[PDB]
């Protein structure tokens, strides 16, 4: 009775169609959901926004176990696929928007799971045009502002700050080396 194509499989499939076919990544970047299109949708939002917010973050209760690894694969593929700037720019813009959104989120394990998972996606993407975009958009400065948008007493705070330091270290190195 469980679905035979879980969202995990659908993500791996889309990652493959991105990695092969140029136009698919741009079509995925521009595609956006509509209000009341599904139970999980509150307002018009991109597929990349949904993958960053609802599927990528670790959550303790399974729906599919390995949704986050494959949303990470999906976003990695959508980066690596050159696709000029159509896919990479919308990916980066949406990561910046989802970072600012999760930092403005109220202090919650939902906030720390979103934040940590976005740091993990910035780190996987970073492992060169993506770095050029991260600099132009000031993403490194939004990572550095992360603790301003934390409660520094939270039991999660050190893990989310570590996560935000991981791309800061790599990015500062790649620039200043």
């Amino acid at each position: 009775s469980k679905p035979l194509m879980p969202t995990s499989t659908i993500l791996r499939l889309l990652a493959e169609l991105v990695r092969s076919y140029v136009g698919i990544a741009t079509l995925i970047a521009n595609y956006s959901y509509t209000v009341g299109q599904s139970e999980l949708i509150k307002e018009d939002c991109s597929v990349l926004a949904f993958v960053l917010d609802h599927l990528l973050p670790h959550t303790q209760n399974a729906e599919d176990k390995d949704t986050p690894a494959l949303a990470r694969l999906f976003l990695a593929s959508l980066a690596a696929a050159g696709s000029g700037t159509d896919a990479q720019v919308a990916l980066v813009n949406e990561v910046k928007a989802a970072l600012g959104r999760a930092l403005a989120m109220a202090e919650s394990t939902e906030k720390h799971a979103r934040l940590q998972a976005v740091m993990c996606i910035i780190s996987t993407i970073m492992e060169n045009n993506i770095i050029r975009l991260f600099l132009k958009k000031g993403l490194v400065n939004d990572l550095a502002r992360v603790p301003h948008s934390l409660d520094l007493s939270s039991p999660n705070m050190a893990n989310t700050v570590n996560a935000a330091l991981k791309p800061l270290e790599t990015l500062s190195r790649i620039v200043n080396q």
Partner: protein, 1429 residues
């Protein structure tokens, strides 16, 4: 013991615990589960004693007991958890149900207070300080998650109810109010000294537990050393806690050393130690408390155990103070324990310095203390050859370990001569002389100190003999009873290796009959606990094996002993024979543990004889007649029925095999055969039947055994059952000695079995085999519940003596198992004997074994049998037995055995058993038998076994090609060809007699499949054997199809064997026969399909239900059972006959009919999905697979045709690719012609030889593999019936049907077939668009795991890619692939070097790599490769 007395005394309780396991620990765990929910002092006493019990279920209560207002219990709980974590990892291994709640309560106790830097140093927490020199935040609560309280005094009452009041006044985070309770009880404590000291002590315990299992910081060591310096002397328990914490912290060590000051003689820790020691020594100076002194010497031990600490204890000269202790300390139990602690430290220190110890005469001090303690035992136990207090025994033990270590250490090699001119031997003499007052491990240490000394200075063995220490050891190890333990037994031979070392010692050792005494251990129940396997994971008899290997090492050092050792071994065997022969003993699982004796002795003898592999012990043993007592052990009357399967019988067999394989001596087999012949001659009454209506002889010998409760346990009560189980043990020994791969041992085995005695035994074993198959099948016929027999008193007369059903069954079951296990061992033996015989006397062994096969196949019961099933069950196991003996694993025969099986008989009897089984003794002809209603119940099971044997017997590809062929040369020469002539001729008639009759209830599809395999082998074989009656196989292949289709209606699973039969009949006959077959199959499909097309006309008038009937009618009509095999057959035929069957499937138009049927079933399936009761017509997958292979074949034929159009058919140059030079080098002309001819035949592979190297080409891969190296190299062919395929109007209907079958989730395997077809069709984007315009990706996403299969996600990914790859996107992706593959010197499974620049880059190879892209689309692939290459 006194523990049990203390338990009974306790079961004023708290007064008894103040004076000082299961039910006392359970009463304690009781009050623990009670108190935590005249009480507290009971809990405290329970803890203070239990903290001794653990030191030689409560936990979940104890964790709650930390929630106490009176810290005494918190301290005591912590002290118990320290005793735990100190000794064993009991709280570390625990699960997180309570390990984390515990460790968190411990953390909240342990966590820092701010140390010196904030005015909370432990020194200041222990000195009073007036309560005004502490930080003002001490009497203050500041608990946050927000609570702050300036001072706790205006509410000093009831701190627990304060915490509960805070629970009511504020919502405190759940499950962490403990950090509040600990803060609140601290702030109550700090007001006063005792409560501050109790917090200090609880924190120190909690630290120590947390390290034996964030808390530690730079000031903690310095704080602890300042706690140790405080000289109010009322703090010794806090000082002991501080030392125990430092101990935990050892497990920063350089800082511990820098603070305590151990690197110098003057220093706080060394001075403290010396003052403790001096107070312990001199009576005037009061003694430092026992606990504190123990914490000091435990800290010294643990510090010494680490090199930095042992080097510090060198530097401060603690050896001088500790030798002072070991010289001047008294005799009382506490002082003894401090002495043993000092000894263990002087041991650790001497593991890295000797000079201090030697300069302080430490060896004289140790020896004097060993003299003093032995002299204090001497009062209790003055005996010396002409209980010890545990603490003194531990002292002696640690001190003897030190002396042994020193002897094995340089820095005594100069001077160790003067150990044994001290008092030491006079005190060892007392330990060795009193192994019952002193423990066995202490008696061991004493004999090992002598042994190690004699091995360091064998010269001074004369001094040890002069003072008689060796003569006391001999008496204590031989004449006095050896203490029965593993380590003592393991050492006796090493001891004797020392005491023999002087030759005078050897004389004295052999004078006192040492092995008669030493080996008695193996026959004594007192030492069986020493012999029992330890840990249950070391071998059986591991300790007797060690003992035997040590006696081997001993008498390989001392060859003069060999003869007496083997004499005492033979006396062991002769005594085991005595214990097995006479009636008065009975083997326990008077009872005697005989089977354990036999296992232990045999592991001992095995070790001795087989240890060095020099065959001196085997020869001595065999020449002293030990093989008779050995081989007799198998036949022992009072051994149990389950002996032969036991490890003791396998041990005796292993010793016989060791003697055989070492000495190469037949005498083991000769003696085994003599005794087996003696046992077989005893049980001839098993061969003689009742000669009246009667059952089993075993059951007439049992039942007539009076009324004995267990007759089978007595050798006179059941002589035949015990002769059975003796013969069984001998037979398991012959099995073990046949499982041998040395051709020489095989040869002498065969020479023995071929003897007059060998063949007398083998004849008697054959008659025994047939008797045991009879007896076992009769007995099972009697344990069956009045079902198998025909209402007759066949064996009832003896069951009436035996005896309401189980009372009779459970008396027979020992008979049934004793007879069935022996039969299986006989069968294993005969199989091994065939193997040895095959690979002159072998020819007589094989003769007697084929006479057994003839006897088994021609055996007829006595004429009192109530039913033929006893014969059919005899025949089935005779046949299943003759199979292993005529044929090897891998089904190749032994031609010696087939020769003798033919000439002697058993072939005529094999086929007569078939005639008998069908005709029922001539009552009915064979041609009517199979179909007769009254055919016996087991006639299908027999025929399954018979057919499985004959399938092996008929196969020419094994019977001619068998590795086990006879050589080429007075004797009649064998021909496997004439054997196959006569066998196929005899088998064919019997199959005739089964060809078309309806099948049996069970064993009818296995019968059919083996019958078809026999027909295949005959039809393939006559073409090959006429090379070196044809019209009968001709007319058969003509008329066989009515039977083939009868088999397809009854037993669908035979269809693969029917395909193979049809293919062999076709390759015998012409295309005029191929056409007839295929057109007849197609006519069956045609009518079966058109009736199903008429089965699904929409039901307008409602005469039938039109819902459940119609939906399941499509799936259940007989026509819908036929198609599922008529289509599947046609598909297998198609796969072999690729193009004829394609052209017939085209020209018949059947494909249109199957497409129309796939269309017309969709309304039915859809209505079924709406009934929610879908049941898929199984015929859908054959149809989809047939269509799949029709369009696979047409693709391919067009491609092969236009390939032929571009090749000259004469001398097509095949070329092999040289990656190293990058050349497509040609083959020789003979190789090219062979490869081309065999490629044109469509063979998958072709073999040829070049330079005597073997090359093979695989046209699946187009690769030449070198058969020697396995190197794979590419090959090419150098270029210079038209199957229309599915038309657009068919493909359109198929696409809609496949989408509808995805809509209704038809079945996993049917979805797999329909998606495979969609995958082939959609490779044209027009049809991929059709498949995507019918909303199939939604259905595919909606599919549930009930409708899934192994390949689903790969296949779906390929289908989606087929939809995504429109002409332009496919073009661009092909450009990407071509550029990538051409730019990167890609590796392959053709040994094309990775990133090569010749081989990896040739156009002719790269086009081979890009072949998948050319198949994906050849036009686009041309355009891209022309534009990008």
């Amino acid at each position: 013991a006194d523990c049990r007395a203390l338990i009974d005394k306790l079961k004023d309780e708290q007064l008894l615990l103040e004076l000082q396991w299961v039910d006392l620990l359970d009463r304690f765990d009781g009050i623990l589960a009670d108190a935590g929910q005249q009480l507290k002092m009971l809990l405290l006493a329970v803890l203070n004693f239990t903290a001794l019990l653990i030191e030689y279920s409560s936990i979940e209560h104890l964790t709650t007991l930390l929630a106490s207002s009176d810290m005494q219990v918190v301290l005591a709980v912590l002290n118990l958890l320290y005793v735990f974590s100190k000794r064993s990892n009991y709280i570390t291994r625990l699960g997180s149900d309570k390990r984390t709640p515990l460790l968190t309560r411990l953390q909240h106790l342990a966590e820092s207070w701010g140390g010196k830097e904030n005015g909370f140093g432990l020194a200041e927490c222990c000195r009073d300080l007036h309560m005004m020199k502490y930080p003002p935040s001490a009497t203050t609560l500041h608990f946050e998650f927000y609570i702050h309280i300036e001072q706790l005094d205006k509410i000093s009452e009831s701190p627990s109810e304060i915490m509960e009041s805070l629970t009511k006044m504020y919502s405190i985070p759940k499950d962490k109010q403990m950090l509040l309770f600990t803060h609140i009880r601290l702030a109550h404590g700090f007001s006063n000294h005792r409560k501050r000291l109790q917090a200090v002590q609880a924190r120190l315990h909690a630290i120590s537990i947390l390290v034996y299992s964030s808390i530690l910081y730079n000031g903690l060591i310095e704080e602890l050393v300042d706690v140790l310096q405080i000289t109010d002397k009322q703090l010794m328990e806090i000082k002991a806690a501080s030392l125990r914490t430092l101990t935990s912290i050892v497990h920063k060590l350089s800082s511990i050393i820098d603070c305590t000051g151990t690197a110098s003689y003057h220093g706080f820790l060394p001075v403290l130690v010396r003052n403790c020691i001096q107070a312990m020594i001199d009576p005037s100076m009061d003694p430092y408390p026992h606990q504190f002194a123990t914490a000091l010497f435990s800290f010294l031990y643990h510090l010494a155990s680490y090199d930095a600490g042992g080097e510090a204890l060198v530097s401060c000269g603690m050896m001088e103070a500790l030798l002072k202790v070991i010289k001047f300390l008294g005799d009382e139990q506490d002082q003894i324990t401090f002495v043993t602690r000092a000894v263990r430290v002087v041991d650790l220190i001497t593991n890295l310095d000797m000079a201090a110890f030697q300069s302080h005469s430490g060896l004289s001090i140790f020896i004097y203390r060993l003299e003093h303690e032995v002299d204090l035992c001497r009062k209790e136990c003055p005996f010396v050859i002409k209980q010890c207090i545990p603490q003194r025994a531990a002292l002696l033990k640690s001190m003897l370990n030190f002396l042994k270590k020193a002897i094995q250490d340089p820095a005594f090699s100069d001077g160790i001569r003067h150990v044994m001119d001290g008092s030491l031997p006079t005190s060892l003499k007392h330990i060795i002389s009193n192994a019952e007052y002193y423990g066995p491990s202490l008696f061991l240490l004493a004999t090992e100190v002598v042994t190690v000394f004699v091995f360091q200075e064998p010269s001074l063995l004369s001094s040890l003999q002069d003072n008689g220490l060796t003569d006391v050891m001999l008496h204590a190890l031989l004449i006095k009873d050896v203490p029965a333990t593993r380590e003592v037994l393991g050492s006796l031979p090493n001891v004797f290796s020392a005491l023999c070392l002087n030759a005078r010692g050897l004389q004295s050792f052999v004078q006192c009959q040492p092995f008669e005494r030493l080996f008695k251990v193996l026959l004594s129940p007192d030492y069986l606990p020493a012999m029992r396997r330890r840990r249950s994971s070391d071998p059986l008899g591991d300790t007797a094996s060690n003992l035997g290997s040590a006696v081997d090492e001993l008498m390989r050092h001392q060859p003069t002993l060999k003869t007496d050792a083997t004499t005492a071994i033979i006396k062991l065997l002769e005594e085991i024979c005595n214990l097995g022969r006479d009636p008065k003993y009975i083997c326990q699982k008077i009872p005697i543990p005989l089977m354990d004796y036999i296992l232990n002795v045999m592991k001992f003898v095995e070790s001795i004889l087989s240890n060095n592999t020099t065959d001196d012990h085997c020869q001595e043993f065999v020449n002293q007649k030990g093989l008779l007592p050995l081989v007799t052990i198998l036949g022992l009357p009072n051994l149990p029925i389950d002996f032969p399967t036991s490890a003791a019988c396998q041990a005796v067999a292993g010793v016989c095999k060791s003697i055989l394989t070492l000495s190469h001596e037949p005498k083991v087999l000769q003696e085994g055969l003599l005794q087996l012949d003696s046992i077989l001659s005893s049980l001839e009454p098993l061969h003689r039947p009742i000669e009246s209506p009667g059952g089993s002889v075993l059951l007439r010998e049992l039942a007539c055994a009076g009324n004995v409760a267990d007759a089978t346990l007595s050798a006179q009560a059941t002589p035949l059952l015990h002769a059975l189980t003796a013969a069984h043990a001998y037979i398991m020994m012959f099995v073990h000695t046949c499982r041998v791969g040395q051709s020489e041992i095989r040869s002498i085995s065969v020479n023995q079995w071929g003897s007059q005695l060998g063949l007398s035994v083998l004849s008697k074993l054959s008659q025994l085999y047939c008797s045991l198959v009879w007896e076992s099948t009769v007995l099972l016929s009697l344990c069956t519940p009045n079902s198998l027999p025909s209402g007759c008193e066949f064996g009832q007369a003896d069951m009436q003596k035996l005896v309401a059903m189980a009372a009779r069954i459970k008396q027979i079951k020992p008979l049934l198992s004793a007879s069935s296990r022996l039969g299986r061992a006989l069968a294993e033996l005969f199989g091994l004997l065939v193997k040895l015989c095959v690979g002159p006397a072998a020819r007589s062994t094989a003769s007697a074994l084929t006479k057994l096969l003839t006897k088994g196949l021609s055996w007829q019961p006595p004429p009192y049998t109530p039913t033929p099933r006893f014969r059919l069950t005899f025949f089935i196991c005779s046949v299943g037995f003759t199979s292993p003996m005529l044929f090897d694993e891998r089904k190749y025969p032994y031609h010696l055995m087939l020769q003798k099986f033919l000439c002697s008989g058993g072939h005529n009897a094999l086929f007569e058993t078939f005639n008998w089984a069908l005709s029922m003794g001539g009552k009915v002809p064979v041609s009517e038998g199979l179909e007769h209603s009254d055919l016996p119940d087991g006639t299908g099971e027999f025929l399954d076994a018979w057919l499985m044997l004959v399938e092996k017997m008929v196969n020419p590809t094994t019977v001619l090609e068998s590795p086990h062929s006879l050589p080429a040369k007075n004797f009649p020469q064998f021909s496997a060809l004439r054997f196959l002539v006569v066998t196929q001729k005899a088998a064919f008639t019997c199959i005739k007699n089964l060809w078309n009759r309806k099948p049996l209830k069970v064993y009818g599809g296995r019968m059919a499949e083996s019958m078809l395999a026999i027909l295949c082998h005959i039809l393939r074989g006559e073409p090959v054997i006429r090379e070196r009656e044809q019209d009968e196989l001709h007319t058969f292949t003509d008329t066989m199809l009515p039977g083939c289709f009868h088999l397809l209606d009854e037993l669908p699973d035979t269809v693969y064997r029917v395909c193979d039969l049809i293919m062999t009949a076709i390759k015998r006959n012409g295309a005029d026969y191929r056409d007839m077959i295929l057109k007849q199959v197609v006519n069956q499909v045609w009518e079966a399909a058109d009736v199903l097309i008429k089965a699904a006309l929409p039901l307008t008038t409602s005469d039938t239900k039109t819902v459940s009937e119609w939906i399941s009618q499509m799936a259940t009509l007989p026509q819908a059972s036929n198609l599922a095999t008529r289509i599947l057959l046609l598909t297998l035929l198609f796969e072999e006959l690729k193009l004829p069957c394609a052209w017939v499937v085209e020209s018949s138009g059947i494909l249109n009919v199957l497409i129309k049927l796939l269309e017309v079933v969709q309304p039915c399936l859809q209505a079924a999905k709406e009934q929610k009761e879908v049941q898929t017509p199984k015929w859908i997958t054959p149809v989809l697979l047939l269509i799949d292979f029709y369009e696979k074949t047409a693709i391919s034929s067009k491609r092969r045709a236009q390939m032929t159009k571009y090749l000259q058919s004469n001398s097509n140059n095949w070329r092999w690719f040289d990656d190293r030079s990058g050349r497509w080098c040609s083959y020789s002309a003979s190789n090219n012609s062979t490869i081309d001819s065999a490629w044109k035949s469509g063979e998958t592979s072709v073999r040829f030889t070049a330079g005597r190297r073997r090359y093979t080409v695989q046209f699946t891969t187009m690769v030449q593999v070198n058969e020697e190296t396995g190197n794979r190299r590419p090959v090419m062919l150098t270029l210079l019936i038209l199957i229309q395929g599915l038309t657009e109007d068919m493909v359109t209907v198929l696409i809609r049907a496949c989408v509808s079958m995805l809509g209704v989730p038809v079945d996993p395997d049917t979805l797999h077939a329909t998606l495979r077809l969609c995958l082939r069709l959609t490779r044209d984007h027009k049809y991929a668009m059709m498949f995507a315009e019918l909303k199939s990706t939604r259905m595919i996403l909606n599919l549930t795991q009930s409708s899934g299969f192994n390949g689903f996600t790969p296949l779906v990914t390929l289908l989606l890619r087929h939809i995504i790859e429109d002409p332009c996107t496919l073009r661009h992706t092909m450009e990407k692939v071509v550029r990538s593959a051409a730019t990167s010197g890609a590796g392959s499974t053709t040994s094309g070097v990775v990133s090569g620049s010749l081989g990896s880059r040739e156009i002719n190879y790269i086009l081979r790599v890009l072949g998948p892209a050319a198949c994906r689309n050849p036009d686009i692939f041309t355009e891209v490769a022309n534009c990008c290459i």
